[PDB]
Design a protein around this nucleic acid. Structure first.
Ligand SMILES: [Mg+2]
Ligand SMILES: [Mg+2]
Ligand SMILES: [Mg+2]
Ligand SMILES: [Mg+2]
Ligand SMILES: [Mg+2]
Ligand SMILES: [Mg+2]
Ligand SMILES: [Mg+2]
Ligand SMILES: [Mg+2]
Ligand SMILES: [Mg+2]
Ligand SMILES: [Mg+2]
Ligand SMILES: [Mg+2]
Ligand SMILES: [Mg+2]
Ligand SMILES: [Mg+2]
Ligand SMILES: [Mg+2]
Ligand SMILES: [Mg+2]
Ligand SMILES: [Mg+2]
Ligand SMILES: [Mg+2]
Ligand SMILES: [Mg+2]
Ligand SMILES: [Mg+2]
Ligand SMILES: [Mg+2]
Ligand SMILES: [Mg+2]
Ligand SMILES: [Mg+2]
Ligand SMILES: [Mg+2]
Ligand SMILES: [Mg+2]
Ligand SMILES: [Mg+2]
Ligand SMILES: [Mg+2]
Ligand SMILES: [Mg+2]
Ligand SMILES: [Mg+2]
Ligand SMILES: [Mg+2]
Ligand SMILES: [Mg+2]
Ligand SMILES: [Mg+2]
Ligand SMILES: [Mg+2]
Ligand SMILES: [Mg+2]
Ligand SMILES: [Mg+2]
Ligand SMILES: [Mg+2]
Ligand SMILES: [Mg+2]
Lengths: 70, 116, 87, 101
RNA sequence: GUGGGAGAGGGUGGUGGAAUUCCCGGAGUAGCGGUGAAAUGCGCAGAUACCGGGAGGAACGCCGAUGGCGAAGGCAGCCACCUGGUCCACCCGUGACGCUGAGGCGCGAAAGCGUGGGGAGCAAACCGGAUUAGAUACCCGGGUAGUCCACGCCCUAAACGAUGCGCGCUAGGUCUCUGGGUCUCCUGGGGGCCGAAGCUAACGCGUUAAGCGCGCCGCCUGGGGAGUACGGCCGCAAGGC
């Protein structure tokens, strides 16, 4: 399976307003994806998590979602 | 006396009981059933067969209301949490989609001693 | 907090000669600056205990440096103490 | 004076009089607290991920400013007191940490 | 000193969503809950389930790790402000200014105390239902203090790495966090795992020493009696030394 960073450009991990790329790092639900599927380093993941929470509080990223086909 | 022709179906399954509430596309309920609505009384209500019978009874009451297309919402976990959906699929109601909306907190409340 | 403007102001004020950075005089001056900053931070925020431990350590270091200065040259020690208003 | 980024999400349904009024009130708040406005980006209508104040959409504003530090919280409060302003997040500016460089 | 860096380090104020409970409303019948079975309990004054709205308290899912920070206790949503510690590079400044530390002083999980707030959920005591030869327990239903906050006390612990602090010396390999570098790698500084020499009663330790040395502090001298008695000190008390 493909990791998120493998298929992506040279993007800003500190931009909480870019929903297009931050949506890639969320799961089918609103959960943040683990490093196994994001292909990020520890520092990169640590920054991404905080930017994702920032975007969430601004109503740009979903706090949680609903699972399908279950 | 409603002629709803379409709606939602919520399956609340626990380890002590499984209940099915068939509702309309904007949230209000139409009919419902459970393991106690049907004959079973005690722990018998938590078996998958009771969940199947409850789903089928609720689906037939929906037929009495005139239900054809059904969207499924699932909350909880227990024996027959899947058997309810299986019977609901083979009940004669065209299943639109299945959704698991089990409410999980963000670590808000302190559980009972059983749950720690 | 303490930006480079204030820091360099104090350093150029307490230098033994142009270019000096780590003289005992300059060390005690910068120490006393951070001491006063923290002690004013601890006038409010009486429940900040870890910063209070940091203040204890800063006091200890400043006192050690002043003891050394007093042991080596008493006159420069008096000058420093009078210039900073300590002890 | 440090560099900050003010995000403002307010009611989308406003017309031009109301929107210009709220925007000029934000401007007056920035003036009164010593906020030098370096740049501005107005996104406007956007689809929220979750409903905010019973509304599925919101109107967005982003201001990069330079203002004194001890006034940031009071400025945030004064910005929040307005009814139509539903979200205020003041963020200290930072450098663009990149990935997959 | 300069210039960079990582962080649930601390304090203050703000702020977000999920969930529980409760209240208002809509729609909707006959049970829900709970257990190994059950019963107390709740439900026709309309519950449970579903939908919308409101209130309030407490805690922060995914990220999260075998991770990080702190002297220890301990510290996880987000934002801002105040502030501590620490690491690296530059080789710039002072010129032994160092190490330890009886006493003292400060900090010190939880529970507990006092005054005043707060109170969703949980829950000693307690009230019931079961189980049993009996049930004063485990299991179920309730439920107060408390848990939360402000301020002042309390000074205990498996307060654990059961390993005091500092420095130097003594094979490496592997995983990792964070810096620098001419960036298959090297070089620092933290977190683990194997294992040289050596150590150990053995288990095991092994550049994060329990190895080889040095300095300083604390403590030990058979078990029970007993962390008891007396005395002193501290404490509102419980009680602690
Ligand atoms: Mg049952
Ligand atoms: Mg507002
Ligand atoms: Mg912190
Ligand atoms: Mg903090
Ligand atoms: Mg009602
Ligand atoms: Mg009744
Ligand atoms: Mg009754
Ligand atoms: Mg009654
Ligand atoms: Mg209340
Ligand atoms: Mg986890
Ligand atoms: Mg700092
Ligand atoms: Mg030199
Ligand atoms: Mg010289
Ligand atoms: Mg010492
Ligand atoms: Mg001592
Ligand atoms: Mg204590
Ligand atoms: Mg306590
Ligand atoms: Mg109390
Ligand atoms: Mg309870
Ligand atoms: Mg109980
Ligand atoms: Mg009995
Ligand atoms: Mg020793
Ligand atoms: Mg590198
Ligand atoms: Mg450490
Ligand atoms: Mg190492
Ligand atoms: Mg050997
Ligand atoms: Mg070993
Ligand atoms: Mg050693
Ligand atoms: Mg030994
Ligand atoms: Mg003793
Ligand atoms: Mg004896
Ligand atoms: Mg005792
Ligand atoms: Mg005696
Ligand atoms: Mg006594
Ligand atoms: Mg007395
Ligand atoms: Mg005792």
């Amino acid at each position: 399976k493909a990791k998120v960073k493998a298929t992506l450009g040279e993007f800003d991990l500190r931009d909480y307003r870019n929903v297009e790329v931050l949506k890639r790092f969320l799961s089918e639900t609103g959960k943040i994806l683990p490093r196994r599927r994001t292909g990020l380093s520890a520092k990169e993941q640590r920054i991404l998590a905080k930017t994702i929470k920032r975007a969430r509080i601004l109503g740009l990223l979903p706090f949680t979602e609903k699972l399908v086909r279950k | 006396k409603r002629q709803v022709a379409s709606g939602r179906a919520y399956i609340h399954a626990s380890y002590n009981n499984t209940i099915v509430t068939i509702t309309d596309p904007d949230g209000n309920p139409i009919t419902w059933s459970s393991g106690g609505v049907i004959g079973y009384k005690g722990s018998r209500k938590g078996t998958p067969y009771a969940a199947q019978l409850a789903a089928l009874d609720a689906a037939k009451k929906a037929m009495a209301y005139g239900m054809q297309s059904v969207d499924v919402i699932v909350r909880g976990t227990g024996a027959g949490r899947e058997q309810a959906i299986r019977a609901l699929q083979a009940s004669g109601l065209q299943v639109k989609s299945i959704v698991d909306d089990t409410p999980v907190p963000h670590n808000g409340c302190r559980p009972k001693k059983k749950f720690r | 907090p303490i930006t480079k403007e204030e820091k360099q102001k104090v350093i150029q004020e307490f230098a033994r000669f142009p270019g000096d950075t780590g003289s005992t005089e300059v060390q005690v001056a910068l120490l006393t600056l951070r001491i006063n900053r923290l002690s004013e931070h601890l006038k409010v925020h009486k429940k900040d205990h870890h910063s209070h431990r940091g203040l204890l350590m800063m006091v200890g270091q400043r006192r050690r440096l002043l003891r050394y200065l007093q042991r080596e040259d008493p006159e420069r020690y008096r000058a420093l103490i009078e210039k900073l208003g300590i002890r | 004076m440090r560099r900050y980024e003010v995000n403002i999400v307010l009611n989308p349904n406003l017309d031009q009089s109301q929107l210009a009024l709220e925007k000029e009130i934000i401007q007056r708040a920035l003036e009164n607290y010593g906020a030098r406005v370096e740049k501005v980006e107005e996104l406007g209508l956007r689809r929220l991920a979750y409903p905010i104040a019973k509304d599925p959409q919101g109107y967005f504003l982003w201001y990069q400013v330079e203002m004194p530090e001890d006034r940031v919280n009071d400025l945030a409060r004064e910005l929040r007191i307005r009814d139509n302003v539903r979200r205020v997040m003041v963020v200290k500016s930072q450098e663009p940490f990149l990935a997959n460089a």
